[PDB]
Amino acid sequence: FCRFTAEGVQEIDYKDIATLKNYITESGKIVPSRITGTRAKYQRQLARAIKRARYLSLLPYTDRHQ
Amino acid sequence: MRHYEIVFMVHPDQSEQVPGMIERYTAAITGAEGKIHRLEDWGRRQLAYPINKLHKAHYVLMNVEAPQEVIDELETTFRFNDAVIRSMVMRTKHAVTEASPMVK
Amino acid sequence: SMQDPIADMLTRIRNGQAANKAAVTMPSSKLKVAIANVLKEEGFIEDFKVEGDTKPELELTLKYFQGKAVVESIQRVSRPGLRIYKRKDELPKVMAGLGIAVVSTSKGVMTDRAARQAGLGGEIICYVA
Amino acid sequence: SLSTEATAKIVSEFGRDANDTGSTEVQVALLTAQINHLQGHFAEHKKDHHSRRGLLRMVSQRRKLLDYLKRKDVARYTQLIERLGLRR
Amino acid sequence: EDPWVAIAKRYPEGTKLTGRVTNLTDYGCFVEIEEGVEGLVHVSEMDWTNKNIHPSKVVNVGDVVEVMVLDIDEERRRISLGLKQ
Amino acid sequence: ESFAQLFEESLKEIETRPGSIVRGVVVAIDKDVVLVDAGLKSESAIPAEQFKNAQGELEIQVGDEVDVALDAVEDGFGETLLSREKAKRHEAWITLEKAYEDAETVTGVINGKVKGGFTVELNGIRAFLPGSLVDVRPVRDTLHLEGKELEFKVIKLDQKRNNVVVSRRAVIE
Amino acid sequence: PVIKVRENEPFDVALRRFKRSCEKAGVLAEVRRREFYEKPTTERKRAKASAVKRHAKKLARENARRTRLY
RNA sequence: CAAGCUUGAGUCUCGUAGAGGGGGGUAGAAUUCCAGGUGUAGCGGUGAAAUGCGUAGAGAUCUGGAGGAAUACCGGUGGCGAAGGCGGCCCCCUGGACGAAGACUGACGCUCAGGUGCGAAAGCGUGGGGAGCAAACAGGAUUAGAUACCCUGGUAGUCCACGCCGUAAACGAUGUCGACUUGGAGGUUGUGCCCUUGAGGCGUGGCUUCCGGAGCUAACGCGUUAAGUCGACCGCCUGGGGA
Numbered sequence: 001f002c003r004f005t006a007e008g009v010q011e012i013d014y015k016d017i018a019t020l021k022n023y024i025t026e027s028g029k030i031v032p033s034r035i036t037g038t039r040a041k042y043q044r045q046l047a048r049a050i051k052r053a054r055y056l057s058l059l060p061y062t063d064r065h066q
Numbered sequence: 067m068r069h070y071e072i073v074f075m076v077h078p079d080q081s082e083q084v085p086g087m088i089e090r091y092t093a094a095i096t097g098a099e100g101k102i103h104r105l106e107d108w109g110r111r112q113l114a115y116p117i118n119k120l121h122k123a124h125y126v127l128m129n130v131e132a133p134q135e136v137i138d139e140l141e142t143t144f145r146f147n148d149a150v151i152r153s154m155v156m157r158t159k160h161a162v163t164e165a166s167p168m169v170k
Numbered sequence: 171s172m173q174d175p176i177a178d179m180l181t182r183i184r185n186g187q188a189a190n191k192a193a194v195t196m197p198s199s200k201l202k203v204a205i206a207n208v209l210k211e212e213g214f215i216e217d218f219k220v221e222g223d224t225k226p227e228l229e230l231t232l233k234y235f236q237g238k239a240v241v242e243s244i245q246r247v248s249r250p251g252l253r254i255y256k257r258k259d260e261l262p263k264v265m266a267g268l269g270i271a272v273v274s275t276s277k278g279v280m281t282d283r284a285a286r287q288a289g290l291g292g293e294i295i296c297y298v299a
Numbered sequence: 300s301l302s303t304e305a306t307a308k309i310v311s312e313f314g315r316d317a318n319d320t321g322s323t324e325v326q327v328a329l330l331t332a333q334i335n336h337l338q339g340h341f342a343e344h345k346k347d348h349h350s351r352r353g354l355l356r357m358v359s360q361r362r363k364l365l366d367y368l369k370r371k372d373v374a375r376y377t378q379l380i381e382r383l384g385l386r387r
Numbered sequence: 388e389d390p391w392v393a394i395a396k397r398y399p400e401g402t403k404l405t406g407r408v409t410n411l412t413d414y415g416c417f418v419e420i421e422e423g424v425e426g427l428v429h430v431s432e433m434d435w436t437n438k439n440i441h442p443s444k445v446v447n448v449g450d451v452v453e454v455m456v457l458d459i460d461e462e463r464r465r466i467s468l469g470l471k472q
Numbered sequence: 473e474s475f476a477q478l479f480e481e482s483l484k485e486i487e488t489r490p491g492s493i494v495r496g497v498v499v500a501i502d503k504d505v506v507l508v509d510a511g512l513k514s515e516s517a518i519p520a521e522q523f524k525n526a527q528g529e530l531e532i533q534v535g536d537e538v539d540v541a542l543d544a545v546e547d548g549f550g551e552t553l554l555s556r557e558k559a560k561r562h563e564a565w566i567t568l569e570k571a572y573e574d575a576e577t578v579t580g581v582i583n584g585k586v587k588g589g590f591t592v593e594l595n596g597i598r599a600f601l602p603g604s605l606v607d608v609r610p611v612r613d614t615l616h617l618e619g620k621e622l623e624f625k626v627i628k629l630d631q632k633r634n635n636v637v638v639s640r641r642a643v644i645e
Numbered sequence: 646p647v648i649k650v651r652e653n654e655p656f657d658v659a660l661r662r663f664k665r666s667c668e669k670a671g672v673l674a675e676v677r678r679r680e681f682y683e684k685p686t687t688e689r690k691r692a693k694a695s696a697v698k699r700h701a702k703k704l705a706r707e708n709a710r711r712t713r714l715y
Numbered sequence: 716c717a718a719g720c721u722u723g724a725g726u727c728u729c730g731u732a733g734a735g736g737g738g739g740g741u742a743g744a745a746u747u748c749c750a751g752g753u754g755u756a757g758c759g760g761u762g763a764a765a766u767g768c769g770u771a772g773a774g775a776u777c778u779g780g781a782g783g784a785a786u787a788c789c790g791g792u793g794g795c796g797a798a799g800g801c802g803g804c805c806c807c808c809u810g811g812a813c814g815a816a817g818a819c820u821g822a823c824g825c826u827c828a829g830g831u832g833c834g835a836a837a838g839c840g841u842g843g844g845g846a847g848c849a850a851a852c853a854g855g856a857u858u859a860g861a862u863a864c865c866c867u868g869g870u871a872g873u874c875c876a877c878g879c880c881g882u883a884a885a886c887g888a889u890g891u892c893g894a895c896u897u898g899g900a901g902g903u904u905g906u907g908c909c910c911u912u913g914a915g916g917c918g919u920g921g922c923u924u925c926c927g928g929a930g931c932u933a934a935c936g937c938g939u940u941a942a943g944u945c946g947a948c949c950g951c952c953u954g955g956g957g958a
Binding site for chain 8: 171172173174175176177178180181182183184185186188189190191194196197224225245246249250251
């Protein structure tokens with residue numbers, strides 16, 4: 001039950017923070033493709049986006065850090 | 067030549083200097099017959115974690131179709147400039163002129 | 171790479187026989203066609219049918235008697251690695267005469283018996299039983 | 300890889316029809332140009348072994364093509380090797 | 388995408404729901420109704436006996452029941468419902 | 473001949489996948505297993521509990537016809553998913569009927585909110601609705617005679633996840 | 646697993662919640678994993694072995710299930 | 716030998732996914748050390764202990780700094796690579812694979828003794844680096860002994876540059892290339908049509924995991940990715956030890 005297949009997105013955006021936030025943990029970790037049911041191709045992209053965000057301090061690497 | 071996408075983060079005390087910097091950056095791009103497809107001052111923004119001890123910073127997005135030499139130059143400028151904390155020049159396939167989801 | 175077409179054809183035929191396939195298709199060649207014809211004459215296959223202009227496909231129609239296959243055995247003898255040529259006296263008898271040996275002679279490709287009758291030997295293509 | 304425009308140019312020059320592209324000579328030329336390009340790269344990056352494998356393969360292919368040309372038609376081959384400046 | 392962005396509707400602590408159970412996995416019961424989600428009601432609550440219960444004996448297969456959320460993680464999509472309420 | 477081919481596309485034309493076409497005739501009853509035959513590869517092992525209505529006892533003898541459901545084929549041996557869900561589609565159709573005249577009228581009787589909306593039950597089934605839907609205003613059916621008779625006026629439905637909160641009393645509104 | 650006790654929330658409940666959060670995180674498990682160095686080979690082996698086991702559980706057992714026990 | 720042909724082989728067009736390679740940047744977590752604050756008697760370790768570190772203020776805790784190495788989550792009998800192998804993020808240079816249609820070349824192919832290259836880990840050379848880990852070494856245990864297993868430390872080495880080494884259960888213990896022979900359940904990555912009426916429906920390609928038929932096999936098992944049915948080329952074996 002993938003979101004990105006239905007939406008039909010060409011590429012996942014690191015700037016689209018809200019969207020990312022659904023796929024990240026309360027502890028900051030990226031959520032598995034088993035749980036979200038994201039398609040494999042998209043999942044990788046999502047992960048990449050998240051990583052990018054983390055570099056730009058848009059998303060946090062973890063809950064504890066400060 | 068090659069469609070880059072740049073996002074740089076300025077120190078929040080230098081927020082009034084930002085426009086000038088942006089202008090300068092644009093100018094350089096223009097110089098080598100480089101187009102600038104979108105440009106979005108995101109403004110002051112709360113950081114997810116405190117980079118270099120400070121909690122807010124001033125984000126500027128900028129999409130550019132420029133030659134790589136100029137990009138390199140820009141990068142160099144960023145690295146030496148102490149106002150800009152982070153940068154992230156990042157290649158892209160197309161021009162991507164439509165606005166960002168956080169501006170909208 | 172494809173090195174021996176006749177051999178390949180033979181193999182295909184064998185597989186068809188094994189797997190109870192009605193007809194077996196392959197890319198056509200003159201020699202192959204001749205072989206097929208010979209087989210038909212000797213009664214190991216029902217009919218063969220070449221079809222196409224640019225790249226024609228030989229289609230053999232395999233034979234089955236009382237459930238089991240007709241072509242009990244079918245081996246190449248001459249092969250690109252090591253050619254076999256027999257003189258009319260040295261020509262073999264496959265299954266003590268019950269099977270046939272396809273032999274290419276100066277007067278076209280024929281069964282071993284036919285060759286013997288003619289009074290000429292040649293390159294031994296395959297045994298069929 | 301070789302840039303599209305460059306490739307096109309190469310094709311036009313060596314190819315008789317210019318739409319042909321697959322002419323032996325044209326192919327050789329294409330290979331040769333690529334090899335030339337990669338020389339610069341490999342001077343810089345001596346440990347890039349994986350990449351060099353591809354280059355080697357290309358070279359081999361070119362050689363094969365040349366050989367083929369030679370047996371078929373000698374004059375053409377000679378011309379080609381004059382044009383490209385291939386020692387053999 | 389669709390259930391998981393605005394997963395704050397049945398959230399707040401204890402919103403009771405009517406949900407059909409699907410398959411009871413000997414640790415669970417898997418009641419899940421509210422538009423493409425997954426709930427568990429695993430074995431610990433289910434009743435007012437803890438461990439000897441075996442959920443196939445105690446409720447049903449395919450039946451709409453009393454269940455409420457008790458917990459949502461909108462991230463690792465595990466809404467952990469209950470039935471001892 | 474092509475009699476059979478035509479008969480196949482005919483039989484394709486005269487069945488569909490969901491529980492839509494009321495076709496399975498109940499051809500053996502035994503407690504606790506009903507069984508039909510809706511023109512499928514095998515007979516359903518039906519529970520008895522998809523077929524007793526609102527007080528516990530059975531309603532349909534031999535020959536009777538309810539559609540079941542489909543789109544799931546062969547778990548080893550057998551055929552269906554249950555006909556009771558079938559019923560859900562009918563309920564959905566009645567709920568949808570509201571849209572036409574902007575008012576679906578039956579009976580809705582809602583005593584209390586498990587999760588903030590009185591529960592409404594229509595015929596055999598009982599549904600849960602968000603808290604507002606039970607009452608038109610702030611009237612509250614707690615002072616009304618218990619499990620009272622009105623209808624349901626719809627307040628809110630969630631359209632994907634099935635929660636429907638309906639409007640007890642206040643006929644005038 | 647950062648948590649804040651809600652207004653008029655019991656202690657025990659809070660503790661339980663915290664525990665749950667921890668479990669979700671898989672923090673303890675992670676710690677256990679990083680106690681000692683696992684050779685890459687060993688890591689690989691475990692992963693593949695585990696996978697194999699899972700597969701066995703899924704399919705063979707399902708096949709068994711088809712046939713009744715008594 | 717001479718002319719052809721396009722099915723093999725290759726070239727061109729547009730896309731596609733990728734821990735493929737080389738180079739240069741950077742990010743965050745954690746360990747270690749240094750400086751300082753708070754604070755007070757234990758810490759650490761084990762099966763149990765002890766060596767060890769601690770009132771010269773450790774351990775714990777907070778602030779600031781240094782430096783190195785590796786990249787949690789994603790992450791998968793997932794992906795890429797000839798094999799060895801390859802995993803944060805960004806850029807530059809770069810090799811291959813696959814698909815979609817066309818267009819072209821016209822057997823240009825397959826295999827390969829010698830030959831040439833690439834080739835984990837350890838190891839060697841010269842110059843750097845050195846946090847953690849740790850052969851050697853030392854002490855403490857255990858023990859009949861313990862030149863081990865366990866504990867506390869700990870140097871080569873691991874890291875980088877450029878050379879050499881040329882081996883591993885370098886394994887699928889299965890040479891490469893091509894053809895042919897019943898099925899099922901997946902994964903991954905394209906792509907054509909179809910009302911995408913929805914996460915779908917019907918195909919068609921590539922790579923891939925498991926089960927199983929015929930057949931094969933000493934059996935175990937292999938089974939369209941063969942260990943089946945065949946062809947081409949190469950490599951290799953001839954009782955155990957000695958070796």
